[PDB]
Design a protein around this nucleic acid. Structure first.
Ligand SMILES: [Mg+2]
Ligand SMILES: [Mg+2]
Ligand SMILES: [Mg+2]
Ligand SMILES: [Mg+2]
Ligand SMILES: [Mg+2]
Ligand SMILES: [Mg+2]
Ligand SMILES: [Mg+2]
Ligand SMILES: [Mg+2]
Ligand SMILES: [Mg+2]
Ligand SMILES: [Mg+2]
Ligand SMILES: [Mg+2]
Ligand SMILES: [Mg+2]
Ligand SMILES: [Mg+2]
Ligand SMILES: [Mg+2]
Ligand SMILES: [Mg+2]
Ligand SMILES: [Mg+2]
Lengths: 117, 110, 140, 100, 56, 16
RNA sequence: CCCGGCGAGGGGAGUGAAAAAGAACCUGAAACCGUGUACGUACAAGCAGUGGGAGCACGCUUAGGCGUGUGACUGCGUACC
RNA sequence: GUAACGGGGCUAAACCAUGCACCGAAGCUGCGGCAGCGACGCUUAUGCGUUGUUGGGUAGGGGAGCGUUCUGUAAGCCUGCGAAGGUGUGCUGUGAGGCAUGCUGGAGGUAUCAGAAGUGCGAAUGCUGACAUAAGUAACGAUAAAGCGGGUGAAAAGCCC
C-alpha cells in the first residue's frame, strides 16, 4: 500500500558507509566508496590475505638460508639433510629459531649436516 | 555559559570573515579592538560589535570585568545561502548566492 | 604469541670495510648489496627496514668482465630536452669513480624509500688507506 | 493525471535527456506506472469445501468447547444491565464466546 | 578552459594556503594613551605638535 | 580607568 | 536590563514540563562548510585499498607483547556500470 | 630518451650434455568448519557420528530465505519508569538481517503465525530540492572621468549647499 522506502534508507547505506579507515574523500565521505572502495578492500582482503601464507613462507626461508649458509652450506643442501631423517625433521616458522635460540638452530645444522650421506 | 555573543546572518560569506576573526583568538579581549580597529576591510567590523557585545555580556550574565577575559573560541559557520537571479546574455544560469554567516565569539579566562 | 620476527626500527648497525682493488668487479656488488640488506645476516627480517654499513675502497681497479671496460656505456639524460642523452665509457667514467661503477649497486636493491637511504650506507672513496677519510671508528 | 499538454523540452538539444510528457511516471507529480482500478479480489470456494470439513472444536479445542443447554429465555426483552447474570451460566467469561 | 575532475577539499586550501591575514605592530605617540596609526599621530583628538586640525 | 575601561567610559557617556 | 545605530541581530532576565520549544518555531538524517584534539605529513610516483607492520598518542592484564584513533616503512595492485 | 635481456650486472649470471638439491599456483596433502548428494553405524518424522563425494561461472533454469506498509491476529502485548524517527556502541547468523543498549526524541509501536503488494535504486545525459566546484576568479553595462569645502548622519568618494 505504501513503501516510503526511506526507512531501509541509510539502514542499507550506513551499513557499508561505515568503512572509514580514512579511505579518503567520498571514498569514505559519500557513496563513491559505494562499493567501488569497500567492495574493493572486500576483495583485496580475499587474495592479498590468502597470499600471506606464501608471503610469510618465502620470509622464513630467507632467514633459514642466511642461518645455515652462515654456518656453511645453504638452504638448498640444508633441507636435504633434514628431510633424509624420518621422525627427525620438522619444518619452518620454527626454523625461525635461528633468531631467538641460535645454538639450538646451530645444533640442527649439525644434525642436518651430518645426516648428509 | 562563559559569556557568548553571536550574530546571526549579518550577510557576508564564510571564508570572507573566517579570515578576519583568525587574528582574534588566543590573546585578546583587550587586544580585541586594537587589532580589528586597524586591520582593514568590512568583514572585520562585523566582529567589532560582537566583541563589544561579548564583553558587556560578561558584565551581566557574567560578573567578569573589562580587562580579563580571553577569547577562547571563535568560529564562523555557514548561514543560509540567500539566493536570487541575475540576467547575463541569453540568460543561461545565474545561481548567484548572496551567502551568509553566523558569528558566535566567546571570552572567558586562563 | 603469533610469530613473524620483529625488527625494532633497526637497533643494530656496523662498520665493515672492503678494498675493491682486487679485480672482482660487479660480482662484488652482490654481497656488497645483500650485505647492505642482510645476507650473511640470518636475523633482522628485512622487507621492512634493516641495514649493515660497508665501505669500499679505491674501485678504480676492477678488471671488468672481458671487453666491457672499453665499451660499457651509461647514459644520463638531463631531460632539459635540447635532445639530451650522454653516452659514456667504462673507460671514460673510470676517470671519476664516484656515484657509479660502484653505484652499479643502487640498482641491485629495492629502490624507493628504505632501498632509498639504504644505499647511502655505502661510501666510496677512490684510494683506500691514505685518504680513507671516513670515520676511523672501528672497522673489519 | 493533470496530464495537460505534451512534450516540454524538444527532443534534441540542450542535452538534458529525452524529455516527454508532464505526466511521466518517472517524474514528479503524476503517473503511477501501474497501479489499478477498484477490482474484485474476492475469491470463490466450491461447496464441497466450505461445507467441507468444518467444525472440530470438539476435536482440538476439545476440552474448550462442545457445550449444549438452552437458549436463555428468562432473558427479558431488551436488557443487558446484567447479561453478566446468564454469563455465569458458563462463568466462562467475556471469553470471546457466541451462540445460535 | 575547464577541468575534468573535482578539485578536492584537500586542494580547496592548497591555494588558500597563503592568505590568513597578518595584522599590525602598532605604536602610541607621546600624547595619546596608546592609539596612533602607524604613521598618523593622535587619533585621540588629532595632532602631533599642536594645532593639527582642532586640538589644544 | 584602564585604557579599555577608558575606551568605554569616554563613549558610554558620549551617550548620556 | 545590557551591547547596537532609537537597526539587524544577540546576551541576561521572565514564561514554561520543556525555549536543546523563541516564533526563519515538532522530530532534525544526507550531501556540503567551520572550531577543538590525537596520530600521520615537506627525497616523494599511480584507482589510493590489501598483507605486513614500527613508532607515538591512549586504556590494559599483580609479565603473559592486549583494545583504540594513527599508520613510517615494505609484498600485491590500472573504480564501477 | 639508453630503449632489440625488463633492469643492475654476468665471460658465466651465455651455450651443449648430464646429474642431485631446492624455490615455486588456490593444484595435491595435512588440519578446523559449510552445503548439495550416494553408503556405514545408530537410532528411528528424525537426526547425528562417521563416510564416498560435489560446490569457477555471463544469457538463462531451478530452490530456499531477508526486510518494508497494510490485515485480521487484538479492548492481546510494549509504552510517559519514553513508543516512532534520528545518533553512538556491543553481541550474532551464510546473507539480506537481527537483538541488546547510551544519547536525543514526545507519542506511538506491534510478538506469533496467517494475508494483501503503490516490496527494496547509483547508474536511465532520469524527474525534485539542497549543497559543492572552478572561486573569493571574470565581472559592475558605453573611457562625457572629476576636484575641494561645508551640513545631517553609526559610517559619506556616491544624498544636501
Ligand atoms: Mg602455498
Ligand atoms: Mg499535440
Ligand atoms: Mg499528484
Ligand atoms: Mg452455494
Ligand atoms: Mg528544532
Ligand atoms: Mg621522510
Ligand atoms: Mg593490520
Ligand atoms: Mg556459485
Ligand atoms: Mg541469472
Ligand atoms: Mg513507522
Ligand atoms: Mg538514491
Ligand atoms: Mg551534461
Ligand atoms: Mg538532475
Ligand atoms: Mg585562476
Ligand atoms: Mg588572474
Ligand atoms: Mg554597472
Amino acid at each position: 500500500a505504501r513503501v516510503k522506502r526511506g526507512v531501509i534508507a541509510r539502514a542499507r547505506h550506513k551499513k557499508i558507509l561505515k568503512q572509514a579507515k580514512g579511505y579518503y574523500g567520498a571514498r569514505s565521505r559519500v557513496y563513491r566508496v559505494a562499493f567501488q572502495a569497500v567492495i574493493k578492500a572486500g576483495q583485496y582482503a580475499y587474495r592479498d590475505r590468502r597470499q600471506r601464507k606464501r608471503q610469510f613462507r618465502q620470509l622464513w626461508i630467507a632467514r633459514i638460508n642466511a642461518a645455515a649458509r652462515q654456518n656453511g652450506i645453504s638452504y638448498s643442501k640444508f633441507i636435504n639433510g633434514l628431510k633424509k631423517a624420518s621422525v627427525e625433521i620438522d619444518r619452518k616458522i620454527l626454523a625461525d629459531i635461528a633468531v631467538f635460540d641460535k645454538v639450538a638452530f646451530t645444533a640442527l645444522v649439525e644434525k642436518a649436516k651430518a645426516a648428509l650421506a | 555559559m562563559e559569556t557568548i555573543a553571536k550574530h546571526r546572518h549579518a550577510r557576508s560569506s564564510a571564508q570572507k570573515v573566517r579570515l578576519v576573526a583568525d587574528l582574534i583568538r588566543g590573546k585578546k579581549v583587550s587586544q580585541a579592538l586594537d587589532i580589528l580597529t586597524y586591520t582593514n576591510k568590512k568583514a572585520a567590523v562585523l566582529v567589532k560589535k560582537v566583541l563589544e557585545s561579548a564583553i558587556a555580556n560578561a558584565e551581566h550574565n557574567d560578573g567578569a570585568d573589562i580587562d580579563d577575559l580571553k577569547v577562547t573560541k571563535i568560529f564562523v559557520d555557514e548561514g543560509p545561502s540567500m539566493k536570487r537571479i541575475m540576467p547575463r546574455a541569453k540568460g543561461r544560469a545565474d545561481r548567484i548566492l548572496k551567502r551568509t554567516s553566523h558569528i558566535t565569539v566567546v571570552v572567558s579566562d586562563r | 604469541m603469533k610469530t613473524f620476527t620483529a625488527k625494532p626500527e633497526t637497533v643494530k648497525r656496523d662498520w665493515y670495510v672492503v678494498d675493491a682493488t682486487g679485480k672482482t668487479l660487479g660480482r662484488l656488488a652482490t654481497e656488497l648489496a645483500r650485505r647492505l640488506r642482510g645476507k650473511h645476516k640470518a636475523e633482522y627480517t628485512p622487507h621492512v627496514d634493516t641495514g649493515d654499513y660497508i665501505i669500499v675502497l679505491n674501485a678504480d681497479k676492477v678488471a671488468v668482465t672481458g671487453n666491457k671496460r672499453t665499451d660499457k656505456v651509461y647514459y644520463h639524460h638531463t631531460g632539459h630536452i635540447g635532445g639530451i642523452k650522454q653516452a659514456t665509457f667504462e673507460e671514460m667514467i673510470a676517470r671519476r669513480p664516484e656515484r657509479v661503477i660502484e653505484i652499479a649497486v643502487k640498482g641491485m636493491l629495492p629502490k624507493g624509500p628504505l632501498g632509498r637511504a639504504m644505499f647511502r650506507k655505502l661510501k666510496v672513496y677512490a684510494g683506500n688507506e691514505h685518504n680513507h677519510a671516513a670515520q676511523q671508528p672501528q672497522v673489519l | 493525471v493533470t496530464g495537460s499538454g505534451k512534450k516540454p523540452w524538444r527532443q534534441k538539444g540542450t542535452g538534458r535527456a529525452r524529455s516527454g510528457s508532464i505526466k511521466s511516471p518517472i517524474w514528479r507529480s503524476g503517473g503511477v506506472t501501474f497501479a489499478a482500478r477498484p477490482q474484485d479480489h474476492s475469491q470463490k470456494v466450491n461447496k464441497k469445501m466450505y461445507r467441507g470439513a468444518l467444525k472440530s472444536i470438539l476435536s482440538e479445542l476439545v476440552r474448550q468447547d462442545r457445550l449444549i443447554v438452552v437458549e436463555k429465555f428468562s432473558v427479558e426483552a431488551p436488557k443487558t444491565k446484567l447479561l453478566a447474570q446468564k454469563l455465569k451460566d458458563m462463568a466462562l467469561e467475556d471469553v470471546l464466546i457466541i451462540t445460535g | 578552459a575547464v577541468q575534468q575532475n573535482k578539485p578536492t577539499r584537500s586542494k580547496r586550501g592548497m591555494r588558500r594556503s597563503h592568505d590568513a591575514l597578518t595584522a599590525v605592530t602598532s605604536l602610541s605617540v607621546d600624547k595619546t594613551s596608546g592609539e596612533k596609526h602607524l604613521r598618523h599621530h593622535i587619533t585621540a583628538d588629532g595632532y602631533y605638535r599642536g594645532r593639527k586640525v582642532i586640538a589644544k | 580607568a584602564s585604557p579599555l575601561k577608558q575606551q568605554r567610559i569616554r563613549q558610554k557617556v558620549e551617550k548620556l
